[PDB]
Paper text:
In the crystal structure of Ftn-1x-3 without Fe(II) or Cu(II) content, additive bending hexaethylene glycol in the C2 interface binds to MeH63 and generates another potential metal binding pocket, along with the 59SHEE63 MeHEHA67E sequence that can be found in the Ftn-L56H/R63H/E67H mutant. In a comparison to the ICP-MS data and structural models of Ftn-1x-3 and Ftn-2x-3, the E67MeH mutation displays dual roles in aromatic ring stacking and metal chelating in controlling Fe(II) and Cu(II) binding. Upon CuCl2 treatment, Cu(II) contents in the two selected variants notably increased compared with wt-Ftn, whereas there were no significant changes to their Fe(II) contents. Conversion rates (CVRs) carried out by Ftn-1x-3 and Ftn-2x-2 with 2 equiv of DEEM were 20% and 33%, respectively, making the latter more desirable for further characterization.
As an iron storage and release self-assembling protein cage, wild-type Ftn (wt-Ftn) comprises 24 FTH1 subunits with 12 C2 axes20. Utilizing the large area the C2 interfaces cover altogether, mutated FTH1 subunits were designed to assemble only upon divalent copper binding at the C2 interfaces hosting their histidine mutations. To still allow these sites and/or structurally induced nearby residues to chelate Cu(II) for catalyzing histidine modifications while allowing the ferritin cage to reserve its self-assembling property, instead of modifying all of the above-mentioned four copper-chelating histidines, we attempted to replace only one (R63) or two (R63/E67), which are noncopper-chelating, with histidine analogs 1–3 (4-thiazolyl-l-alanine, 1; 2-(5-bromothienyl)-l-alanine (BtA), 2; 3-methyl-l-histidine (MeH), 3), separately, via genetic code expansion.
Author numbering:
A (entry chain G), B (entry chain L), D (entry chain E), F (entry chain K): 4 to 177
C (entry chain D), E (entry chain B): 4 to 176
Write the structure that this text describes.
């Protein structure tokens, strides 16, 4: 049965929105895993943990806003399993940052495919939603992760534990 | 003659902007009619009246912003008659909400056709104007009107006058 | 059936109130047209536009108050088409002021005929309503528009664009 | 290798903590599903949605605190898939409240089994952790959900939509 | 090699961003020239100078935002010579306003071509960037410059120095 | 014709002021290039970028003050092309600081030649203008750039990326 509010909202866009919801929830799960990995007593980088917890919360907000959009357009939310992250151990702050960069680029690629689908279906409201709330957020996150990776590599990470300690203090601390 | 400021502004877009101006003015007229229908002593739903007056003011602001855009791009405003609404009596709060939902969906359809036209003419400024100031406003208005219709139906409207009274108090009051 | 609140409210008064509502809505439409005429890039008199937008809001408030009165007395609102203004181009600030003076005098004439009808129907509440909320408002608007036309004419409008610019700055600003 | 901080922390307690983490994340997922079910335009009970979103946040805080405890005792976090909820459609406010009551009782049962395990392993710190941060939280949640279900049934839910509307307004609103 | 952050960013978009940076810097240079032209003792219209200095600052901020975007997407900034303006003497306030209108329309045309390129490359982030930070800014600047030119012409500029004096005082002040 | 305000303002001084205007604009351009070089994701030294942006603004203020002086004395501003900087890539923070030191010494040499010309033309107002607003600014900028180069060299730059990171944090940050 069609929703009383549905208008110019293709079924493919609805399915793709559900997939994007699942993907953003998965990204939040990955970031939560990273955060509490750096909370371990044998890693002990509290600011890495805080940074990744903040990224987890940001991805969760992305997912919730996608669910709200789904309801706004008359689509129907269908949730799926949130897969566990690929790693239980993230090795180092540099490796965690590189994995976060890869994850953000994958989420951005999915969002670009979603925008392409919305464009092909002539859905300007969905295109504008994606542009306003996701595309530049992903661009900024990717640029910041690239900066962090560059600085960590230049400081001597991951071989230099002093490098990761000082980066945790001076960049991710304040 | 051509305006000294006109640039990448097609004649068809100008005419469509004038048509949209007339349509938004008509929608404001319809909402004003509804509002003062609920002000009648034999209807007496003060919060319904306030809600529809607010919707009238919003539609009028849409029309004024369209006129400002027309002047910004070097087009020329051509006003037409504002036709009276199709009904003098709106029967009930639920029926008024359903008519408002239908009207907002018609205005949204006209806005989507206008955006398709702006896209065909390669007018990205007009596309951005429509996306930023109208499309999501329509989506939110339609979602809210659907919520109102749903609650009124589930409460027992329009047969239950108690339902419309309580909805006027608890939803449209605060 | 008759409204439970209707008392001493003649049918002719009700019809005339509906006509006056349509007229006030039309006057607001005309003022809106003028306002956005002076917003054009080839006219560009911001304060003329602001003045006429304010007049448009005043006329719309008059119409809403008439609708409220109609409901207060037990009458029934019947809306009609709001006709487009007679002009799309108002030529100049002086000509727009003269057209506004003419429009306000027509609205005042309609209001005086409505007061005459209310008097013939022995409806003192309606007479007092018109006196309190419309008649002096019209007298003041007409006096102000006459002052504006006089100043614009004496300054050299409409031939002198400098005159309309300075009037836009110093009077309407 | 064994953590430098591990002391009197049994492996079974560690595995059970991981299981409890997964269960609390699952409960948060269920509550989020419920919340955005009530955000649908054909349901439109915003206070039900807010209440269930708050319960989702509560379960997520429970999960994060369990992860922090795991790291505190020298255990190692191992995350698993977060299974999708059993329902996509929650039918009614009363049925959603009943499902939430069932869910809270299941989480409480798991917490009680975990406390029994901690008692058998002579881990008084874990017993105190569970008592202080979870058991009474569950008792309060279960009591409140029972109150809500009782009021909804006595008002005439789920047949009376007026009942769910008024309960959304007067109980979950203020 | 390709930046670790580069994603869906075409080489043509990068080159066009560099060209747009050069163009915005050039527009800032032209506005600075105009501003300090009106600072001359034989012109002496301080508010024209203030207006054009503000426009120079706006165009340079546009250029800095383009450079920030270039770095955000993984492109590489390549700066070029900033050509001197076509005029050292701008003759009058009206002629300066007309030249500014022409310049803003040229910048807007380049921005529209850049947006069309971004559309052809299916780069929605760049399209949104251009729409959000440039297109409406250009539309507003062009509308305002048109208003200024219209008022200056109607007041009697450029033959009437009194017109430019009064416009400097009452509009740009 | 001669300006009504011109007095004791030689033709050579006017031409030299125009040349100095071009040179200060060129220096601002060079500093802007450096600043946005350090904004690159593969360099990522935020405080170096801020420092060089500030130096760019300082040089632009110098140029604007020269233009104001030109108009004050009755001279006529003649602008020229602002040449692009000699480098697109500044290699390192230490090399950028050394290039900035070289640039500031070149600007100072031009200012000293300009003061020599003003002295030969018996223009005490121009001498005082140069002394008050430019010469000591150049001396202070050169001293500061020398301090920065010295510290960067002593810390181990440019081979040690940790050195440039820590200098960015502790010197250019506060
Ligand atoms: Na857009
Ligand atoms: Na992100
Ligand atoms: Na609307
Ligand atoms: Na009036
Ligand atoms: Na709970
Ligand atoms: Na501009
Ligand atoms: Na300097």
């Amino acid at each position: 049965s069609t929703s009383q509010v549905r208008q110019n909202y293709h079924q493919d866009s609805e399915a793709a929105i559900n997939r994007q919801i699942n993907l953003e929830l998965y990204a939040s799960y990955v970031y939560l895993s990273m955060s509490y990995y750096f909370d371990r007593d044998d890693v002990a980088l509290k600011n890495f943990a805080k940074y990744f917890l903040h990224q987890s919360h940001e991805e969760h907000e992305h997912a919730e806003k996608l669910m709200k959009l789904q309801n706004q357009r008359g689509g129907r939310i269908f949730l799926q399993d949130i897969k566990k992250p690929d790693c239980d151990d993230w090795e180092s702050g540099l490796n965690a940052m590189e994995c976060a960069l890869h994850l953000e680029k994958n989420v951005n690629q999915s969002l670009l495919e979603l925008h392409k689908l919305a464009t092909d279906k002539n859905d300007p409201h969905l295109c504008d939603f994606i542009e306003t709330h996701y595309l530049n957020e992903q661009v900024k996150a990717i640029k910041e992760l690239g900066d962090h990776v560059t600085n960590l590599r230049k400081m001597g990470a991951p071989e230099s534990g002093l490098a990761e300690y000082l980066f945790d203090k001076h960049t991710l601390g304040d």
